[PDB]
Amino acid sequence: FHSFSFYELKNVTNNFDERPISGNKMGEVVYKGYVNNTTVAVKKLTEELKQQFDQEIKVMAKCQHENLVELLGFSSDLCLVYVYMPNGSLLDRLSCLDGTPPLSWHMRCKIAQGAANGINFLHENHHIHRDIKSANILLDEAFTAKISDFGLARATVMTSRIVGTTAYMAPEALRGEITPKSDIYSFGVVLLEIITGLPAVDEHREPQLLLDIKEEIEDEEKTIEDYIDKKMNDADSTSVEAMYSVASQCLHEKKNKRPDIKKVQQLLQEMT
Template sequence: MQALPGSMDSVAMTSELRFLPPWARSQLAHILEVTHGWREVMGRVPSSPWQPGSPIPQDLHYPKKYSSDDIHLISEECVRDRREGFEVLLEEWGTSGRQRPTVQDLLELLRLAKLYRAMDYLTINVLHGEALPRQDGDPIEDLDKALQEGLRTYDNFIQEMGASGEVQDIPSSYTIDEPSSDDLALTIAPVIDDKTKVIGTCNNLTPGQSQAESPPLDTEVLQDLQSSGFTHFSYSLLKEITNNFSNVPTDLGGCKLGEGAFGVVYLAKIFQGGHEKKVAVKRLNSGEIKVEGQFKTEIEVLSRCIHENLLPLEGFSCDGPDWCLVYAYMPNGSLQDRLACSGGSEPLDWQIRVRIGEGAARGIVHLHTYQERPLVHRDIKSANILLDGSFIPKVGDFGLVHLGGSGTHTRTLIKTTTVFGTSAYMAPEAFRGDISVKMDTFSFGIVLLELLTGLPSYDEEREGCDLLSHVQESEAEVEELLDTQAGTWDMNIASHLFALVGLCTEAKKKRPTMVQALYNYSQIINKQLD
């Protein structure tokens, strides 16, 4: 297998769909959006007893995983959120079941649906293989020509879309004389010769004055950036201090800290206030059409929602070919890596784990309660809980945060068929499209279970692949489930925390809010419960 461009990973026919790199997912989504081919794929996905890796049934009457109503609802949601249907399909189908669908399963569905352009892209550009044979009698040249023209039209349309979802004329630049609160120009730090420094004085740089071609920023984003108070870092600076966005991992002498659905994160050093400071630079995937939403959401949330247990944003960059977000660097990495003792790190003792759980809960509660309209994180997991030098947890990755309606913190905030987050952490109702603050409660319960057991949230090799099923199906006592690497647990605290996990992962109606869960947590660790 050959390495993917810009990635340390590789893709094979047997690779799970959820591991397709973002650039491949994005291009496939573009191709399948032109003729709504993703609907054809979704409508052909088999249901049980079919298992991933088995031949796709060709009988038209075999059980289907998704109904026509499911496809219609997702289509409506994609229109509202300006998303592409194939992305949503991958998020749902690609993470469902104990045995996950593979690239080979997708290829077979594309072949049966005669979606040859997507099939060729997957086999040639992603798998680096030869084009698969077509079915006899298909007018391939005319179909490919039509799809190519349609894709160009679609890409142009996306570039012209404004925040309202209507086609707008986007000016090449904004001209101003003096900056004011009404200006659409972006107030940022100018580029200077000494690219190892960040300065505080500001000039005005508009999209038309950028160093390189950038994705179009809508007016709302520009206004938010202008008032955010965050530092702007030039793209050339970030490129230099990350060694040209080196994809060599930090433990091998490079700059890459990690990679997620929205982009790659790099370690860098800057000089600010006369002192050297480490930062984490997230370069967003420019191929993703939802990148503007990610960029805007992170800045909106972190400019208004400041808390000791939320990851602080240092600044941003939008004057280059890729947008970037710059965060404070967390030297102890993610909770997921520390529980796995990645890089040979020492196991976390149980007292530190208990404090991490409480801090993470406080950060989530702040998201839910700091304003009248609560924010739902929707992607709480150990990989998104970062640890500073003192192991104080910082909840991060706010790109999926949903701003809810006004009202109580227990109400359902949104009904949607779009499923986000990581499957093992997701509440059952989320798969039905019901997103509320209690979704974060369920996810927190899984994180707490990781802290107690030291086990990963998902493991294909064990009985009960997801952690909650594994524990629920186990006949072991609490003492046997606890991670012995954490030292000698206080059994009273551990038993009550296991009980809290049970509450947090109950059915939605019985599940507490995070406010209630945090109150119970504090009572437990302060030994105020018998």
């Protein structure tokens, strides 16, 4: 990793312009930078902010995969410079934010496969992400899935400080348990977002939580066909049902009854 001086980063981000690009700010603070013709994502870092900065460098140094975001450098006032992802997050693309076209079913299968390949690398290298969600699955120029945000990542165990996203968390994760099986539950929610194009949580929706549709389908009140994203023209029944089967297995309420990331990876390969 390159050690950037604060002035190199202040300059490339137009004095850290906090106005949206349509300025330099792309979201929350993350700015668009230009270092040596190359575009970069500069994250400028209620006192655990300094604590997150150390954990991210540590995990990034050890974890380098094609389905994980690459950290280019850091600065020390604290900054983290990453490889720029032109197609934003899976969340933004599924919601078609800023008039972007809907992702095809074909593209969606490749993202599911890619994201699972990234989680497989993490679990093979004994890392638990703890915050697997579509906002943390970024997309490059070819729509290759890239797992991001390793601030909460950890190397049978219980914690006093429960962290993650409530709408994506496993029952045991909410109880304080730290296990890679919790990451499998979170990926099941992400697969449901890919299938439906719906957010994991919507306060003006029945059900409010997307994971609750599994029970609606199992209690034969509704079908998966009723929930399939209508913003697609290539979603064949066979592969959508096959992805919902993986999502359903992932969302098993009992950790030991869920498949490992290798089986998830295997089932997604079989789907195509």
